[PDB]
Amino acid sequence: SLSNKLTLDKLDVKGKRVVMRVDFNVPMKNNQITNNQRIKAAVPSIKFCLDNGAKSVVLMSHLGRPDGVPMPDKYSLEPVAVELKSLLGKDVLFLKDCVGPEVEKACANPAAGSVILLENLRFHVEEEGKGKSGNKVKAEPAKIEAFRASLSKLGDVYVNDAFGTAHRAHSSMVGVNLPQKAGGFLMKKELNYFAKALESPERPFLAILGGAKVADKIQLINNMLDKVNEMIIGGGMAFTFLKVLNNMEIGTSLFDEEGAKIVKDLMSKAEKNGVKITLPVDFVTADKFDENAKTGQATVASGIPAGWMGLDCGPESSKKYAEAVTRAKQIVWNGPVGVFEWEAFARGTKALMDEVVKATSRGCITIIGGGDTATCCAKWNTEDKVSHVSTGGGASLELLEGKVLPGVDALSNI
Numbered sequence: 001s002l003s004n005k006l007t008l009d010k011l012d013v014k015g016k017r018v019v020m021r022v023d024f025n026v027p028m029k030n031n032q033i034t035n036n037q038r039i040k041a042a043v044p045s046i047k048f049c050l051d052n053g054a055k056s057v058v059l060m061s062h063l064g065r066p067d068g069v070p071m072p073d074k075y076s077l078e079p080v081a082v083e084l085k086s087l088l089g090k091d092v093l094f095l096k097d098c099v100g101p102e103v104e105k106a107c108a109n110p111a112a113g114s115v116i117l118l119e120n121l122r123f124h125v126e127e128e129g130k131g132k133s134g135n136k137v138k139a140e141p142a143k144i145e146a147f148r149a150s151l152s153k154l155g156d157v158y159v160n161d162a163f164g165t166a167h168r169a170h171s172s173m174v175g176v177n178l179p180q181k182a183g184g185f186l187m188k189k190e191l192n193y194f195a196k197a198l199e200s201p202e203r204p205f206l207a208i209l210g211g212a213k214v215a216d217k218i219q220l221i222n223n224m225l226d227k228v229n230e231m232i233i234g235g236g237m238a239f240t241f242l243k244v245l246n247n248m249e250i251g252t253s254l255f256d257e258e259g260a261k262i263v264k265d266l267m268s269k270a271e272k273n274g275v276k277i278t279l280p281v282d283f284v285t286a287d288k289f290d291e292n293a294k295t296g297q298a299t300v301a302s303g304i305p306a307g308w309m310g311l312d313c314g315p316e317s318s319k320k321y322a323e324a325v326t327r328a329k330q331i332v333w334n335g336p337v338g339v340f341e342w343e344a345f346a347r348g349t350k351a352l353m354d355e356v357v358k359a360t361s362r363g364c365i366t367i368i369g370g371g372d373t374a375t376c377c378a379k380w381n382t383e384d385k386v387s388h389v390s391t392g393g394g395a396s397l398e399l400l401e402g403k404v405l406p407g408v409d410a411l412s413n414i
């Protein structure tokens with residue numbers, strides 16, 4: 001189902017006004033652009049619209065956590081419009097707002113081929129439906145409707161290329177009421193790879209799940225147990241498993257008291273569905289949860305001593321993970337297996353990444369989830385050595401958990 005939605009390439013844009021939700025949430029300081037990866041990513045869609053004779057391309061986006069209070073001093077899209085101007089090679093009109101009669105007059109009938117960028121959408125509480133020196137404060141249904149009609153007035157067709165926000169029922173996500181709502185090329189990529197993963201995956205299908213807590217991932221694991229042939233359970237999660245399944249001593253490591261109660265239920269579902277579960281067997285320990293702490297080594301047989309904590313897996317665990325990855329024809333990896341921000345505890349994640357790169361090289365379908373694992377793909381420069389790297393963490397997680405995305409659902413079928 002995720003595949004049969006309308007995309008930009010199947011849309012007719014010649015002579016129409018295109019209003020397009022992009023992902024320009026580039027988090028950098030001094031109002032100078034240090035990493036414009038997302039801007040470069042959103043370029044092919046704008047260029048398609050321009051090179052197919054569109055009258056205008058209007059771009060709405062967000063940046064920061066302002067919670068619906070105008071913060072133009074600190075979180076303004078202005079420098080982006082400069083960056084974009086270079087990457088497009090074309091003038092881009094920056095407007096000081098994204099709604100109202102002035103913006104509506106600006107976008108009513110612009111010159112042929114104009115590119116316009118609106119001010120941050122999250123200056124308004126009506127985008128997210130709730131916000132905040134004003135503390136937490138809400139929105140008003142009539143005002144949300146007015147905001148949505150104002151965005152709807154800005155173009156003849158709508159394009160959504162903001163996958164990372166597609167799990168939020170926000171006004172820019174579901175409140176543009178135009179006859180055709182298409183998905184941009186980033187959207188098309190995401191929906192293709194994840195519909196293949198969730199609907200008809202190559203087999204054997206492997207899921208690699210890491211994280212710090214078991215309780216928030218239950219449904220994830222649960223849904224992943226209806227899909228896959230193998231599961232690797234790594235990261236801080238695993239100790240909660242090992243303390244419960246094998247009575248392992250874990251030292252000062254993360255323990256999920258709630259998730260400890262459902263560990264055996266998940267193993268029971270895995271046994272009922274015939275899923276092979278791979279947990280770590282050795283560990284790199286630390287004296288404290290710090291970057292420059294003393295290190296050590298432990299095994300499931302030895303246990304972790306008191307006062308120390310496990311922050312990464314060891315070489316034998318890497319061998320077992322590589323066994324699992326070697327058997328796989330499709331892989332989905334969400335969440336690293338160690339504290340990769342700190343070089344002393346990034347060895348397991350790096351080794352698993354190398355194994356996934358080789359698997360890709362010999363024909364595996366390797367999808368990397370948003371969040372920290374995409375950050376790993378960027379930190380070791382391997383985005384071009386895997387099949388797919390998702391652009392959104394929460395959205396991809398909610399797709400994996402089996403949920404329907406409000407922004408995706410709001411696209412036109414056929």
